Amino acid sequence: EPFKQQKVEDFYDIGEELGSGQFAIVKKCREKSTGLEYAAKFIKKRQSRASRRGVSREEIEREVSILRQVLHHNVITLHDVYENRTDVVLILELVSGGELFDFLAQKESLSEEEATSFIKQILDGVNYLHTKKIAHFDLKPENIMLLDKNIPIPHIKLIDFGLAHEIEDGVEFKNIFGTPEFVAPEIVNYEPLGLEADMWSIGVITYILLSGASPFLGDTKQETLANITAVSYDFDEEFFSQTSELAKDFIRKLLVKETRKRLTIQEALRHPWITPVDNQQAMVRRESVVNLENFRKQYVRRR
């Protein structure tokens, strides 16, 4: 087994707790030898059987097997892996530039062309994963992070690969998964899963990015889930008054009931709204905007 048997305190000086999840606590560390700013995700190891605290010994080396395979600019990169007994701490690439949606909340104008700049960033990291047959099933606005906040056009990093899985060809993989809003209908029913699931999320992220209101959330969880299986999403004129017919079409072709008819990542990149062919399309994309009034009002309530 490729793991290190050194005390993590002897090599890295631990500091600020950046943000704790539920079964793991993430703390901003620093290397003793190089003085380089790094992150350190202390993941609590599980006891023996039906323990309430801790993640699996099998499922922890799965999240690692993904991150070792992931070398790309638009996703996060794993620096080092330490373990002792209590915890398995992962030294990751430190990211301190807030959510993407946090940076977009700041913007006072932001066009639909300017918006596509970022969407493309996401798609890039996503395509790298799909190429390696990896599926990041947790794709929410809180997972879409930024390296630095100061830059005119900032870098996007994708984080938290706990809910990532290497997909085989013949081997089926069913499971009940993460967040009420951003989940495919194939996930809601106990149905086989693939890379197709990720693409659904993208469409939901885009929908909210352009308007602020979610396409499937109702009032109760019960409703939200029935909406996703029923595939009910309305482009209300209150939110989408000044949004393009190519933006609506990009989202419309991502949020499909089936899996065959749902767009692949290559198809998302080769879509007009993302990569146009002529000026006739590029003019509409330029002269369209994102409804920041609603986007600010909706995103404010998530804090």
One domain, residues 103 and 185: yes
Binding site listing for ATP: 18-26, 41
- Active-site annotation holder among 87, 138, 160, 198: 138
Return the number of other C-beta atoms located less than 10 Å from residue 201's C-beta: 25
Binding site listing: 18-26, 41
Two structure tokens written together for 225: 């889930």
Last residue in a domain, options 97, 122, 137 = 97
Query: How many domains does the chain divide into?
Result: 3
One domain, residues 88 and 120: no
One domain, residues 74 and 113: no
Q: Bridge partners of 4?
A: 82
One domain, residues 240 and 291: no
Q: Which value in Å is the resolution of this experimental model?
A: 3.6
Return the number of other C-beta atoms located less than 10 Å from residue 87's C-beta: 18
**103, 149 contact by CB (below 8 A):** yes
User: Which domain does 18 fall in, by range?
Assistant: 1-97
CATH of the domain at 284: 1.20.5.460
Closest C-alpha to 187, from 239, 218, 178:
178
The span from the CA of 214 to the CA of 235, in Å, is: 11
CATH of the domain at 32: 3.30.200.20
One domain, residues 269 and 280: no
138 has catalytic annotation:
yes
One domain, residues 153 and 266: yes
CATH of the domain at 242: 1.10.510.10
**211, 291 contact by CB (below 8 A):** yes
- Could you write out the three-class secondary structure of the chain? CCCECCCCCCCECCCCEEEECCCEEEEEEEECCCCCEEEEEEEEECCCCCCCCCECHHHHHHHHHHHHHCCCCCCCCEEEEEECCCEEEEEECCCCCCEHHHHHHHCCCCEHHHHHHHHHHHHHHHHHHHHCCEEECCCCCCCEEECCCCCCCCCEEECCHHHEEECCCCCCCCCCCCCCCCCCHHHHCCCCCCCHHHHHHHHHHHHHHHCCCCCCCCCCHHHHHHHHHHCCCCCCCCCCCCCCHHHHHHHHHHCCCCCCCCCCHHHHHCCCCCCCCCHHHHHHHHCCECCHHHHHHHHHCCC
Return the number of other C-beta atoms located less than 10 Å from residue 66's C-beta: 19
One domain, residues 127 and 263: yes
At position 212, the amino acid (one-letter code) is: G
Q: Bridge partners of 80?
A: 91
* Beta strands at 78-83 and 164-166: parallel, antiparallel or unpaired: unpaired
The span from the CA of 55 to the CA of 176, in Å, is: 16
One domain, residues 167 and 224: yes
